[PDB]
Amino acid sequence: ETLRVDPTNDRLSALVEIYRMMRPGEPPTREAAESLFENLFFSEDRYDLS
Amino acid sequence: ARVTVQDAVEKIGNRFDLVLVAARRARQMQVGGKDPLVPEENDKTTVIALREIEEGLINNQILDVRERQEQQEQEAAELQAVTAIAEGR
Amino acid sequence: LKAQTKTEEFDAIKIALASPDMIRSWSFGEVKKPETINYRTFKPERDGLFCARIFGPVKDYECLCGKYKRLKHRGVICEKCGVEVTQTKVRRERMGHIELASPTAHIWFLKSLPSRIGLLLDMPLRDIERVLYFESYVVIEGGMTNLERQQILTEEQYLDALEEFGDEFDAKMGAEAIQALLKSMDLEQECEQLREELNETNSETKRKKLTKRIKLLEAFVQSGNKPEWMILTVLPVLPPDLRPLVPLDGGRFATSDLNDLYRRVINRNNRLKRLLDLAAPDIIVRNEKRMLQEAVDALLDNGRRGRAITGSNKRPLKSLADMIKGKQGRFRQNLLGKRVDYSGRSVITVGPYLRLHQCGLPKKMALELFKPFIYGKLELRGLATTIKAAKKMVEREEAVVWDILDEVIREHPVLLNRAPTLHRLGIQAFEPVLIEGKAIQLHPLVCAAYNADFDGDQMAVHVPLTLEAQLEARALMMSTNNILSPANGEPIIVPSQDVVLGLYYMTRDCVNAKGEGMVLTGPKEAERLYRSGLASLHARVKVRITEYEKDANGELVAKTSLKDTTVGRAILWMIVPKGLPYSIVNQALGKKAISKMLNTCYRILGLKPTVIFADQIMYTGFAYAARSGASVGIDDMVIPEKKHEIISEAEAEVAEIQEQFQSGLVTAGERYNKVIDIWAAANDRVSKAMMDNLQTETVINRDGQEEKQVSFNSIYMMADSGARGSAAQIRQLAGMRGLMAKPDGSIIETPITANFREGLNVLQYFISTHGARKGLADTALKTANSGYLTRRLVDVAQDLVVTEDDCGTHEGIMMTPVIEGGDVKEPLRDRVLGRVTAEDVLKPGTADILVPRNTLLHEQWCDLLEENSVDAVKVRSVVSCDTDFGVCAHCYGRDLARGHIINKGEAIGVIAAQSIGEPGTQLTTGGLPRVADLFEARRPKEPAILAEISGIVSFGKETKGKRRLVITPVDGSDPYEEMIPKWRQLNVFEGERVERGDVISDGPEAPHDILRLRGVHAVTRYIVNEVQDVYRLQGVKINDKHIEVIVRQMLRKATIVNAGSSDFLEGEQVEYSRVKIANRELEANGKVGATYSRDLLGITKASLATESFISAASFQETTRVLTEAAVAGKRDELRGLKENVIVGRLIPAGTGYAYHQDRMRRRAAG
Amino acid sequence: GRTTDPVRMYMREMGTVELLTREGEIDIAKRIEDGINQVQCSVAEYPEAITYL
């Protein structure tokens, strides 16, 4: 059902919705969505649970 | 010292108008226009006025009357002075 | 006569929108530059936010350039740089302006929740904002072509439409657009058309909105406001000293945030003028216009767009809206508080030597406080040459000044106040007594009123200055003048702890003591017998006494007799004044009895005797308690010998039920209940063991072998007298303490077996800790809830004041004893006491009027009613009062610290709110939140429903989520049918008749229903009875009066049904309405008089409506109130308390009631 | 569509305009020369413009 409410289809689309979620109103870019999403929880720089 | 004001409140009903009247009379004493109607115990004008209320010799009626008289008492003096202002014509 | 032009003592106030020309009228110059000060010579750069020319001279009576320095040249405008030399204070006054390049929306009227520009134009907000940002084009005065007047177009669309129609069509964009829209708008024509459209089409949806909007429009027209003024052509600049640049230590400067904002605005403005003169491309000048809009918005009210930040500092900058609003919720500096001269404070101590009319005031404190009086009194007697020398003297603290201070102190009262001020007794006036020390001494009997412990609480002193303040403090706020709680006629001066242990120890009797059985002439030789050590304080003895009864006519009868009493009672009798019978002192004298002594004394002898009586009671209580040698040891707390056995047996029960759970005879939960019950029973048994043993165990011999009486043990005497301690706490000391409960509220089945006299071990203490922390938390929270509640209360009441004398209506509520379910949860006598009778009442036989129509029922009248069997009295109330915009004193009641009828002009709403509020700390659906729910008139979660109309009912249709109920009135039409969800179990009988307001289901019911289907008396009775249930369950005494005035404020507004003057469905004042239909019943239309329907508004809701807007701007959301008032051009006449408090003149109540009245009649007259 | 925050309604509004080719700059500049020289010549054809000087 979670999928039944999912507006997206493919990776790039989801990344678009996420990038437009975090930084709304400004035009989304591929490199932008990728960079943001990779930099949120996956970067050694911006993320640590230690 | 007046420990309770209840008797003065008996003499004039309102108890707010008591504060007002007593204040008026109190100023009649404090600014030196007049003198007490009852022996001063070293009681300040504040309490003297209230004692004057308790004795029933001071209230709104009496004060208004007295003032109304004094108006004409000044009119009596200034009569000849102000009637001399006929230069107005 | 020439009325006037220049300064008078003003009345009312007016608020409205501001014309550009008006803004110019205020402006004494246009600030053209962002510059502030020159940066070396700190002089103001001319025409800048800080300016000498526009605003004023930097220093007093001195030109900026320095040419004219003399106090002579004044009205002179300097030739070099024009500055009229005048006090620097005028730089705190004179306004300024800025002429903006492009028009600008005033953010208050754009972003106020009901957007003013938006609903005036019937244009949606998002559209308007889309227009202001140059994100689209909007039509103005479309003429007849293709297009609506308010229609919005895009770039390409505007181009196409323009190509089609060159003229006879118009479209703009940006601020100029909206301004052009507002200017073009003709309100009157819209009025006509909307009246017509209202008339033609029948739909609820259509004519609701139609009528709302037409009313809005015509109100705006009547205001005098022209819509254009919502768009700012000119922007006023605030006076420099109200946003100062003033220097600090280290040579650093500090300035208000309004300077950054104003600076930004001026900058972008000038840059826009520049960009216009440079013929810039559209994309640029548009950006600049937008930025200017943002800057202006940020200046006026910041945070409705971007929340701009101040230079180099992250924290957002405070705007003018934030200047007005303040902080700490809604506080306008007359609200949160204001610092005050001639004041002080310090730690407080006892001072039992004091009479109740005085207080110890520290020497130094008195000197500093009365310093100006001292200066004047010093040179009046001629001890000091001049005021300077006087200062030198009091600073030197020369010997002679102390006497002068004793002079200025004598008849001059001082105001004493404590930290949590709730009821009016939180501040009391005292006669100062000079004391060596830094501590304030406060009379013990007053400690109850302040709720002041001695554990380091502080009190603040305020010196009444003006004569009127001295006399107010002495005749009103004076301690001796309030002996009785305004909430209920019972004395607040009741002896507290040590004193009552004294009087209790005094009159009490042991079985055998020195002087047992002998006889004495009178109290004198009784006391003489005691002090000589011959006779014991407590011994059964016959002594002759002379008592009095005033029961003759105004006259004291004398009677003498041999009374069977004790030595102590005989001694104490010496104090009791005059007409009181010896019966009052011949008892054991507990706290309650020792209080009723005072009460009776007051209701018999009058004020003064009661005062001095209480004084003597305090003195003797302290002295004899001191003599008594009462103490507390570890052996004073006696544990039951049978305790361990009870523990053991009750511990056997748990292993019984445990064995049953092991064998499975009983379920786990049932087991749980069983064990919990056996342990609870155990605690009850131990408590009722230690209570018997502690209470009666004194076993003592008189001439025989044995006799037993009530114990003389210290802790018992303390708990019994009412001095301190209670059965619960004593139970915690000797007997085991309770059963605790986890934060969940699941009560632990292994209670604390040990007590405080014994030790508690680790676990027991840990478990007790939660109870402690939750206790402190809950109490400290209920303080806040109390405060909030009182606040809502005075907000809803306030301006209600006794105004007229007697409205003279027979109307009132039926007063019966509360009679709940058992016997008499509260008598009739308390409920009807001090209350005026609505009409004459009867004996069982008649044409005999005991109480004659309207008469204050005092103690004698109530006792006369009590002699006869009368169960019922109809009583006038504040809720039923015919008087509009206030209560008549004849309706209210007598209640006050004085037994006489309520004075004309006392503000009752406030004291009612306070009276309800103060005990609120002592309240535990039920509870204080229940009280709040009641006063908020909140529809409960699972409410019942009452029969809409009387007559036989039955069930209809089916199961759609509602199974419909059909009611059938006898004579009248049936059609009333209500949809009752059938999934709720019903009550009402399908075959039986049900009266209107019967139970068609179960559960609590919303008081809206009680008001509509039962009616006003029924609803006020429901509220008062339920809230009084809550309070009285906690042992709180509150007279029905205060609750009834709050109730009156709740129902103040009502909705009309019929017509002939004003609109149909409007909620409005029943004062206004009733005074209008009473006026309409004759003259006017012969009778056109409308029918209304009484409405119930919650206290927080009813507080919303206030005539005065200044008042509303205090406790409500300020930003909205100011706008909403400004559009209507609302004119605030003051007339209330809060408003006059804000504006800083005399309160239209109390002493000021003579002023405001005399002025009120002068108004609207010749 | 519009997040407000005027930085955006600018950034997007200017971002529509297309970047000039290296030749377009010279086309436009030539147009500039054309216009100006037209007003200069129009000034030279006025007698009072001479006499005044």
Ligand SMILES: [Mg+2]
């Ligand atoms: Mg304390």
Ligand SMILES: [Zn+2]
């Ligand atoms: Zn000058």
Ligand SMILES: [Zn+2]
């Ligand atoms: Zn009334």
